[PDB]
Write a protein that binds this ligand. Structure first.
Ligand SMILES: CC[C@@H](CO)NCCN[C@@H](CC)CO
Ligand SMILES: [Ca+2]
Lengths: 1034, 49
């Protein structure tokens, strides 16, 4: 109550609003970086892979006598004079630049289309002084400076050139490669300015504007509080009343949250966000790493920098997901201490409301919010927005309304799914009008509405603290043009994915969404039928229902329609659980006909939930019951629950036609007390189902790896993840067994071989990432030496006769210097028991008798080379000599079999082979299971060349690799041209027949290509500056 | 081809395609029927009738 607090509020609020409007347009400081190619004055290939795929400018100028060492005798395999891609790549011709020599003409192919050409003896003339070339976003142009055309289609005497316009013909650069070796001549200057438009930094003026704007916003809200305390009333607390205490229900919810934090399924996007947050410190900005050309997360993701600071202690999965655990605890304590005692007296004194609020909270939290996504932030922000607004209405004060505006604008920019907070923002307009219209008669309009504007615009200092306005606008338009962006009428796709048979449409997610819709419909029907739900307050009940409906309507304007975007309803679900429990009791709903119909509806949506699989994501699915089939004991849970639903309808019809009630009949029993809360029983039954299913998944694979076993190992060191339980053989030529009779040639097909193909495999289908010891000419996988490994086969191009193969006797090693596996490699499509092992002792093989038989098992895509494996625990400890055996059961020419000799591999773990220092190309799924391995960096538009690659399993790799491909951005558009892959044998340490994924080596085409060095500078740019358009690959 | 009772979402998934099954006329008819039914149910709940 002072005039000074009425002047300070106006002045500070207007200054904060002006400094917030001004700050996206203030200058920055770009770091300019260009590539001048001849580094030390010699012909040497360099390696500079650009992340935006193209430079904003390119200029090469080759003299005449540079190409003197390009033609001569027939000892010249030297084709290219200059390139921006390695010529050995399959896609090198239709993506980059070449000044390659076709047989007698020196031509430069740019983006698959020729630009200029000339005969080579005319280039080596004393004319043709240059080979000027230039590339831009509108035209490319080449020119032989010195000569003209001859007797051809063009008239001679026109000074030969070539231009291509009307399309973006800029070449992709992954380095500058060549095929010469001498000292470089004069001239010969390639130059390219790299697009480092996001490598900015604030200037002094922008930094002072951000500091002064935040200070003025704080001073304006302090003056707003001094105005609000004019009526004589003091503080006396901040928190609710029963905050520092525990009950049994709080202990139960806390125990379920902690145990799900350890043995719990994770979401899909955790390695994505962890890899982004790990590389963003060296990059200097927050780039989206797997897609869209290195464009940043432009207004969204203010908290990824907090995750990047949080990850300096350790990158373990129990450490990185600990703020999400704290958000879940805070969310339930806000629900039970602030919302439920606010919704009335019948909601506050009843216990069934508390139990079903806890149940719907856990049923939304557990399948949907165990990760690094922005979903818990948005859920807790919607609750805190509603609680601040609801406290502003009661005490009739404006400062909690301004705090709610700050929190709502803060959670609006967590992710694109944060648009659900506009429900809690739009419901808070009527209350704000009611509060402002009461105070305006003694303070005014400016003094009450300038801190509201300052608090509304304080978030622009957080969005635009690193980027400019032009960068974020053009990047958002470009991401909408390139990537997957569905419109508002494609909202049915989210609900079509909810009803699939996949991890998107599993039991838990489907149950959560259908139970939310049921509780919302019952609350709306009881609000329409009576005036309100009877024992509850009017305003808060209305505002809960309105916020939930506007959240459902606002969720259709998101660019992607996924199923894990329903995790924003985890705070509203406890509130609707309390309302839908009060709306069902005998005090509110008086007829038992209606209560039996509601119980039947609960049973019907529970029946509809179990009509799918118990499927979870990538490695959360190991060992889980019913993870690939419908849950059933003998019939199916869905048919049993449908029968119970029909029986409940028949009981309701008998209640209808008999004309009977309950109030002088059933006072209280124990099952009658259990029966009146259908939502509590259904929600806690599904919560116990989920928790017990992942605990049993952890128990079924105990010596093998599981998610929960790694999270419980992490309490005692061992924070590497899956990298300790994957065995890797580097050299696949090491543990070959030795035969007893003839040497290592024909000893594969020693004693019986009819239909044996030493070159009898199809050369076209059998392919994986001369002369042989068997006379073979086939390609061997996994780095097998053709001079030591014989190959047989069972394929032919004529009429097919049956084939029987029977090997020689192979000596077995000692039982301490032997690995856990016996491996043969095999190609072709065949059945389970086609290839077998036949072990014997010394005297059993001297008598030529079987002695035993085990069968190989297989993991792999057929018909390509794969590894067949069998443990040595299946071979009894008295066996000394083994022998292979094979037979093809007809099935026409397409069916076949290929075979190599037996091998006991010498295995090391993946943490010892792939260390913690080499750059690894991780996929966007394999990020939280491999936390010790580091991804590759990028600093000024140039990326670091990886050495390894880790993939998911085959079903997961063939459906998720189009995120990272060439058509969307992606680092698989760079390594597709620069590097060649090579598979490595890898086995899961105790669950040998499981497809965990795969590992690859990445080898350069030119091994003598050093990294480049860039010439750095500093330029002061403005807030609307833009160097060049963003080229989209189409 | 015989789908079960829990495959009832497939009829609406076909209604929201871009094909002669999900054309303008059929989609308008079904959505207008659902709108009129919801308004009738809401007015029957709110008042007596
Ligand atoms: C195609 C993969 C999807 C989800 O499955 N990832 C969504 C993108 N992740 C966002 C941040 C988690 C970045 O835009
Ligand atoms: Ca055959």
């Amino acid at each position: 109550n002072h005039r000074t607090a009425r002047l300070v509020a106006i002045i500070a609020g207007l200054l904060g609003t002006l400094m917030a409007i001004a700050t996206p347009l203030l200058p920055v400081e770009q770091t300019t970086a260009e590539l001048n190619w001849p580094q030390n004055g010699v012909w040497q290939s360099v390696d500079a892979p650009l992340i935006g795929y193209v430079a904003t400018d390119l200029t090469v100028t080759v003299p005449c006598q540079a190409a003197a060492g390009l033609v001569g005798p027939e000892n010249r395999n030297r084709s290219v004079l200059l390139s921006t891609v390695p010529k050995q790549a399959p896609k090198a011709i239709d993506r980059g630049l070449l000044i390659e020599r076709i047989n007698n003409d020196l031509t430069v192919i740019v983006r698959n289309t020729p630009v200029v050409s000339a005969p080579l003896e005319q280039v080596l003339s004393p004319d043709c002084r240059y080979l000027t070339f230039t590339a831009h976003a509108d035209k490319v142009t080449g020119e032989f400076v010195g000569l003209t055309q001859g007797p051809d289609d063009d008239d001679p005497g026109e000074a030969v050139r070539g231009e291509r316009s009307g399309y973006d013909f800029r070449p992709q650069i992954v380095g500058v490669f060549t095929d010469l070796s001498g000292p470089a001549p004069e001239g010969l200057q390639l130059s390219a300015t790299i697009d480092t438009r996001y490598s900015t930094s604030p200037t002094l003026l922008k930094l002072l504007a951000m500091i002064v704007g935040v200070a003025m916003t704080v001073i304006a809200l302090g003056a707003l509080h001094v105005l609000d305390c004019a009526d004589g009333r003091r503080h006396k607390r901040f928190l609710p009343s029963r905050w520092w205490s525990m009950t049994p229900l709080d202990g139960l919810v806390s125990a379920m949250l902690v145990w799900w934090h350890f043995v719990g399924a994770n979401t899909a996007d955790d390695g994505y966000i962890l890899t982004m947050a790990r590389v963003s410190e060296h990059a200097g900005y927050m780039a989206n790493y797997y897609r869209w050309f290195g464009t940043p997360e432009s207004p969204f993701g203010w908290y990824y920098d907090l995750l990047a600071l949080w990850a300096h202690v350790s990158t373990a999965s129990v450490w990185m997901r600990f703020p999400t655990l704290l958000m879940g605890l805070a969310c339930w304590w806000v629900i039970s201490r602030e919302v439920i005692p606010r919704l009335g007296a019948a909601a506050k004194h009843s216990r069934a409301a508390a139990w079903t609020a806890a149940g719907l909270f856990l049923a939304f939290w557990l399948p949907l919010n165990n990760g690094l996504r922005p979903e818990p932030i948005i859920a807790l922000g919607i609750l805190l927005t509603w609680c601040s607004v609801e406290r502003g209405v009661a005490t009739s004060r404006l400062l909690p309304v301004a705090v709610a505006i700050i929190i709502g604008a803060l959670t609006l920019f967590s992710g694109p799914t944060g648009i659900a907070a506009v429900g809690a923002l739009l419901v808070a307009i009527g209350p704000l009008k009611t509060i402002v219209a009461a105070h305006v008669s003694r303070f005014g309009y400016w003094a009450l509405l300038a801190p509201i504007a300052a608090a509304g615009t304080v978030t622009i200092f957080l969005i635009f603290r690193d980027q400019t306005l032009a960068a974020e606008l053009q990047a958002s338009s470009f991401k909408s043009a390139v990537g997957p962006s569905l419109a508002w009428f494609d909202e049915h796709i989210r609900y079509s994915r909810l009803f699939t048979t996949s991890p998107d449409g599993s039991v838990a997610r489907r149950f959560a969404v259908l139970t939310l819709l049921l509780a919302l419909a019952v609350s709306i029907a009881m609000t329409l039928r009576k005036g309100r739900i009877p024992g509850t307050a009017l305003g808060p009940s209305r505002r809960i229902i309105g916020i939930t409906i506007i959240s459902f309507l606002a969720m259709m304007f998101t660019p992607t329609k996924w199923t894990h975007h329903f995790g924003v309803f985890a705070g509203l679900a406890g509130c609707l659980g309390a309302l839908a429990a009060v709306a069902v009791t005998t005090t509110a709903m008086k007829s038992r006909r209606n209560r039996t119909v509601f119980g039947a509806a609960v049973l019907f949506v529970t029946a509809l939930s179990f009509a799918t699989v118990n499927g979870w994501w990538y490695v959360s699915n190991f060992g889980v019951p019913w993870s690939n089939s419908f849950p059933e004991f003998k019939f199916g849970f869905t048919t049993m629950l449908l029968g119970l639903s029909v029986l409940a309808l028949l009981v309701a019809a008998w209640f209808h036609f008999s004309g009977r009630d309950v109030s002088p009949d059933r006072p209280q029993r124990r099952w009658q007390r259990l029966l009146v809360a259908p939502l509590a029983v259904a929600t806690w039954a599904l919560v116990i189902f989920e928790v017990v299913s992942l605990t049993l998944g952890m128990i079924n694979q105990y010596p093998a790896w599981s998610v929960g076993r790694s999270n419980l190992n992490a309490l005692t060191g061992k924070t590497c993840g899956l990298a300790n339980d994957v065995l890797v053989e580097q050299n696949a030529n090491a543990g070959m067994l030795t035969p007893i009779g003839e040497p290592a040639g024909q000893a594969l097909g020693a004693v019986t071989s009819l239909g044996f193909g030493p070159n009898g495999i199809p050369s076209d289908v059998s392919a994986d990432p001369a002369a042989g010891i068997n006379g073979s000419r086939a390609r061997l996988p996994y780095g097998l030496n053709p001079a030591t490994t014989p190959v047989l086969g069972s394929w032919r191009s004529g009429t097919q006769q049956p084939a029987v193969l029977r090997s020689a006797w192979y000596r077995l090693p000692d039982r301490d210097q032997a690995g856990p596996l016996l491996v043969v490699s095999a190609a072709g499509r065949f059945d389970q028991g086609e290839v077998e092992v036949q072990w014997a002792t010394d005297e059993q093989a001297a008598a030529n008798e079987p002695g035993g038989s085990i069968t190989f098992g297989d993991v792999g895509a057929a018909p390509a080379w794969r590894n067949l494996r069998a443990p040595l625990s299946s071979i009894p400890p008295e066996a000394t000599q083994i022998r292979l055996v094979a037979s093809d059961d007809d099935l026409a020419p397409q069916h076949w079999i290929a075979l190599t000799p037996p091998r006991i591999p010498e295995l090391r773990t993946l943490q010892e082979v792939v260390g913690s220092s080499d750059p690894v190309m991780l996929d966007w799924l394999v990020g939280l299971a491999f936390p010790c391995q580091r991804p590759f960096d990028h600093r000024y538009g140039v990326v670091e060349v990886p050495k390894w690659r880790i993939l998911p399993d085959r079903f997961g790799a063939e459906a998720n690799s189009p995120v990272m491909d060439y058509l969307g951005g992606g680092p698989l558009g760079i390594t597709e041209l620069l590097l060649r892959p090579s598979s490595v044998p890898t086995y899961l340490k105790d669950d040998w027949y499981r497809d965990w994924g795969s590992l690859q080596r990445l080898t350069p085409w030119y091994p003598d290509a050093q990294p480049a060095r860039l010439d750095l500078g500093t330029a002061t740019r403005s807030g609307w500056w833009s160097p060049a358009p963003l080229r989209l690959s189409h």
